[PDB]
């Protein structure tokens, strides 16, 4: 498999089904060889949902530096709603294979078969290639890691906290490959949301997982000697959004989200000293 | 070390760019350091994950690896075979040194109450050597002897490969 011919082709804006299959198998083996709770070392750029908006991902790299000029961590949701899931996920897996210890991908609630069958990715695979390719993608996604801890201070996942999570060893015990269940720790890490109007835990309007208030966030941080929760699962207008007095932050990197919205995209740059700033893509 | 935002030390928190050709470089990969802090794995998805292709292989070659897990540094699995005669010999042929040598492990019949009278399934378990040099390849394939013939599952000619550290 020639990785550099692929990355070359992807950055000129068509790929054979076997090249895509190859990216899936190689990246899957890498994902399994590394922990499911990644322990990362800053400096680092952390990005939220991309949802197939490939030209906006390219803009994210133009702005934050192409790999490996900067290290990246992506909080899931690569493949739905937008018009180019295939290109988005193929560039990301290509880069994960090329720089496997400076490019990181987490699993978001749309890298599940029960979801991306319905909201577009399966249709893209079916039209441009065939169903078997979507089955291969699904087996790949089942091997993505679930959360990351930057420098023993920043906890990153796609959705948020869980009422079952007492210690990280629960996350480390989760076996891969696996589908996401409808309830439980893995589910909550990909689906739960913060709410300002919740004391503790409450039900979640989407019908999956739960909702946590600021007190749950502060008690969590103090128990684990952490400084910031960094998640990314819902559109925010300024691209980033603070919660619980800058104890949690929501990132969303896909601007003008499927044209329905007018939001900007954002990405968080954390340097060596753990000093955080934001880089934003505001549309015209 | 501890988290602090740019507001707090006087700089700008936000830096917003408003929007509406290829270039190549050569890079020494030792000048960038790993961002990760720190075993054996299988370099293939279990054939049975995609049933349609498993069925296609199994009906073409009469033998196909069904399931395969790596438990400790021991590889254990199940093999499916077409029930052509009564006496069968199912072997795993495995190498720990890029096929300079191989050894033939015998497989075991499993009762398997359900699974039809058209196929039978065999188990295997192989202890990997304690130390295996990093440059060596670990590969294995499957032989099925029955009814005066030999059948092979060799994973469409790539063998089943296992990769280290
Ligand atoms: O021993 C070193 C050997 O190891 C590696 O090969 C292993 C392989 O990966 C495993 O899969 C294993 O299992 C069997 C194989 O997978 C099955 O498919 C089956 O093979 C059948 C063939 O698929 C089928 O095509 C046919 O093969 C005939 C050939 O068409 C024909 O060319 C000839 O073969 C002779 C060759 O002319 C000649 O090259 C020479 O072989 C030497 C190789 O060139 C050399 O690289 C090395 O082989 C390696 C190999 O590279 C690794 O991948 O040593 C060889 C010395 O023999 O000699 C050949 C004849 O002696 O004839 C063959 C038939 O004889 O039929 C076969 C079944 O008959 O069977 C495989 C087990 O026999 O195989 C090896 C591990 O043993």
Numbering used by the authors:
A (entry chain A): 7 to 19, 29 to 299
B (entry chain B): 83 to 102, 111 to 128, 133 to 259
Sentences copied from the publication:
Dephosphorylation of both enzymes is exerted by protein phosphatase 1 (PP1), a pleiotropic phosphatase involved in the regulation of cell growth and protein synthesis, other than glycogen metabolism. PP1 is directed to its different pathway-specific substrates by scaffold proteins; PPP1R3 are those orienting PP1 towards GYSs and PYGs. PPP1R3C (317 amino acids), also named protein targeting to glycogen (PTG), is ubiquitously expressed. PTG is composed of 317 amino acids with a structured central region, containing a carbohydrate-binding module 21 (CBM21, residues 133–261), flanked by largely disordered regions.
Crystals of PP1 in complex with PTG 70–264, encompassing both the PP1-binding region and the CBM21, anisotropically diffracted to 2.7 Å in two directions, but only to 3.9 Å in the third and worst direction. The structure was determined by molecular replacement using the above-described PTG-CBM and PP1-PTG(81–107) structures. Two PP1/PTG copies/asu were located with additional electron density corresponding to cyclodextrin molecules and part of the PTG sequence intervening between the N-terminal region and the CBM21. Residues 111–128 could be almost identically built in the two copies, crossing PP1 and joining the N-terminal peptide on one PP1 side with the CBM21 on the opposite PP1 surface. Extensive interactions are observed for the PTG residues 124SALK127. Ala125 and Leu126 insert in a small groove defined by PP1 residues Pro50, Leu53, Leu55, and Phe119; the flanking Ser124 contacts PP1 Glu116, while Lys127 inserts in a very acidic region of the PP1 surface defined by Glu54, Glu56, Asp166, and Glu167. The CBM motif sits on an almost flat PP1 surface by using its β1 strand, the following 310 helix and the intervening loop. This poorly interlocked interface is indeed slightly different in the two dimers in the asymmetric unit, then pliable, due to a rotation of the CBMs in the context of identical locations for the other PTG regions. Interestingly, the PP1/PTG complex organizes in the crystal as a butterfly-shaped tight pseudo-knotted dimer of dimers.
